[PDB]
Design a binder for this molecule. Structure first.
Ligand SMILES: Nc1ncnc2c1ncn2[C@@H]1O[C@H](CSCC[C@H](N)C(=O)O)[C@@H](O)[C@H]1O
Ligand SMILES: Nc1ncnc2c1ncn2[C@@H]1O[C@H](CSCC[C@H](N)C(=O)O)[C@@H](O)[C@H]1O
Ligand SMILES: Cc1cc(=O)oc2cc(O)ccc12
Ligand SMILES: Cc1cc(=O)oc2cc(O)ccc12
Lengths: 343, 343
């Protein structure tokens, strides 16, 4: 028959057990345990304290989808795909699929995706009892997990956007929602004359300060606890919004942008580090995974290039320049948008 | 880079939003509405009462994964894969992905798959408040949805297993857990001398009786409400277990098989309609989807050919014959296992 391939494709795409099998394997650290020598069901069950027959049934699906393969009778090893769940693999896919860590936990919000399409509003609170950042505020362990997921490569992940801007006429930088300070730190190393301030929430400010202390940068990058919907704590020649605005619906993103514009020194610029696909180029899996996560986690949104033009104008700004940022590590297209005050 | 394809494969397999996007589209009947003429976001939002920008964001992922394509600017149509979500397509994939119907609703149990691997026990009750069949018993609408999902092709789905057995020396058939009576009805049509009894739960017995009345078979197939862990209501030359034993862990499946053996007339046989892959042949997506659903819904299990040999022996039975059943419609390998009393 001719629709057999189509039927197989639809069933795979619609399968909820397959991603949960991947995330279960990640959460149980199965691939790590296999690499450390536990190749049989009976050894792996003892290492994970799972029930042996139930673990075999999980492993069977892991083989079926090509993450594991049966080497010898009853002995399993990771494939090239499965090896990506090793804890120290540079793409960090084990942690990003670990159900006890903040993002895969938040992905359970997708079980109520019909509600989010009807309302345009997040479903996270309906599952976990508080909106996303309030939940993180009440669970410092999840706050720390989220911060480390985003900041994993922060020793070098922010080098490209910091190198993509000319800091010669910048004296003070304000990184609004600046995470653990990785972006501020990368700017400080590249532009030694610059002083920087990180504005962040409780909890995150402490690991930011602690990170900057380890880096020897406390004298050049300070950390302020605060709320970026309130007046910003100081003015700056460059104000950074790195993976901030996508957390927020249009009206909140305009309020944040407005606060930033109000805090700009003369000649200053606002720097947005995010995606900016043209609408025509946005029908791709990288854009939609992040965009739909922002919907169900937060009620935020990724913005196409067209929408950035509109959002800037609403905040009194113009898009002066968009710099494409190289990710020759793993292809994830990101941009640095440079916004200036409108005429 | 060389691990780009591997990384892409892992991320797709681990994506929870993609199957929820498919199920959301199925639940909103999006493909039906498109085929009826609503091709734009603005028309489809009004037909589904969703928020237009949020619906566009869903559609974007549906295009990205190849269920929809943008025909004209802002107009979307289903692909060959997407057309399978039309409500009347014979593979019934819309209903099987509809979150308001019993199976896709039960698939939310997979969000707690780590618990099921640790315990070997279902997670359905922890989500919905009662174990699977008790939940169906308290929600007659879900009971009816489940019964119709399984019985969809019952006018012809049971023709092959009914044709695969020689009914010449059978006088009475008992179909234990016989659903809406489709299998009993197919036997009655092929073997007019046979009389049959369907044993089923509350609710299901009424739609079974109603189905058999529509078929003109009330005089030949009767329906008894009861519990197949209790003594069976009568003896039979052939006792049918069609998609029953996989609902149950080994010790419960032995109890059901034992009840059946105790009710067999001399010379009688027990007929099992299920999968029976050799363990070596079971590392495939058809086996694992059903097997893992039985785990999280019910604590049941699919049994490999080796396990059937063991289960039969535990119940005092031998596997006399296994007949492979043709499904040239869509390839789903099923078998008819014929069990006889052990020597
Ligand atoms: N009202 C608020 N005031 C200040 N910071 C906030 C805030 N709401 C959210 N945030 C911060 O916004 C950040 C978005 S995550 C991005 C972190 C970092 N800029 C990076 O690129 O990786 C979070 O760290 C969160 O703590
Ligand atoms: N304790 C019990 N006693 C009798 N029937 C039961 C039962 N527990 C579950 N069942 C029935 O077992 C059936 C399994 S579903 C299979 C239905 C049908 N034989 C078919 O092949 O499609 C359900 O219809 C359910 O109502
Ligand atoms: C880059 C990226 C990918 C993703 O899948 O989820 C995210 C969530 C965030 O809060 C910030 C960034 C990302
Ligand atoms: C044949 C089949 C496929 C599936 O995916 O789920 C099922 C669930 C049941 O209770 C009975 C049969 C099936």
């Amino acid at each position: 028959p001719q629709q057999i391939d189509a039927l197989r494709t639809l069933i795979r795409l619609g399968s909820l057990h397959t991603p949960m099998v991947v995330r279960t394997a990640a959460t149980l650290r199965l691939v790590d345990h296999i690499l450390a020598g536990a190749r049989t069901v009976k050894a792996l069950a003892a290492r994970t304290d799972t029930r042996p027959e139930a673990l075999l049934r999980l492993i069977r699906h892991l083989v079926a989808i090509g993450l594991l393969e049966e080497d010898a009778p009853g002995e399993f090893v990771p494939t090239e795909v499965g090896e990506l769940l090793a804890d120290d693999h540079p793409a960090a896919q084990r942690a990003w699929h670990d159900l006890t860590q903040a993002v895969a936990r938040a992905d359970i919000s997708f079980t109520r995706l019909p509600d989010a399409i009807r309302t345009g509003r997040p479903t996270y609170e309906s599952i976990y009892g508080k909106p996303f950042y309030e939940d993180l505020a009440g669970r410092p362990d999840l706050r720390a997990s989220f911060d480390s997921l985003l900041a994993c490569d922060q020793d070098v992940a922010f080098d490209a956007p910091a190198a993509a801007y000319d800091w010669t006429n910048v004296r003070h930088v304000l990184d609004v929602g600046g995470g653990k300070g990785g972006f501020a730190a990368a700017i400080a190393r590249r532009a030694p004359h610059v002083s920087a301030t990180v504005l962040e929430m409780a909890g995150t400010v402490d690991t930011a300060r602690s990170y900057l202390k380890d880096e020897g940068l406390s004298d050049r990058v300070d950390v302020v606890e605060g709320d970026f919907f309130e007046p910003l704590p100081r003015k700056a020649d460059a104000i950074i919004l790195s993976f901030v605005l996508l957390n927020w619906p249009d009206h909140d993103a305009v309020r944040i942008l407005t606060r930033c514009a109000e805090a700009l020194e003369p000649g200053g610029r606002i720097l947005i580090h995010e995606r900016d696909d043209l609408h025509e180029n946005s029908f791709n899996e990288q854009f939609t995974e992040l965009d739909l996560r922002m919907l169900v986690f937060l009620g935020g949104a990724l913005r196409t290039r067209e929408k950035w033009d509109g959002l800037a104008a609403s905040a009194g700004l113009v898009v002066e320049e968009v710099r494409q940022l190289p990710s020759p590590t793993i292809p994830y297209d990101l941009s640095l948008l440079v916004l200036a005050p409108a005429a």
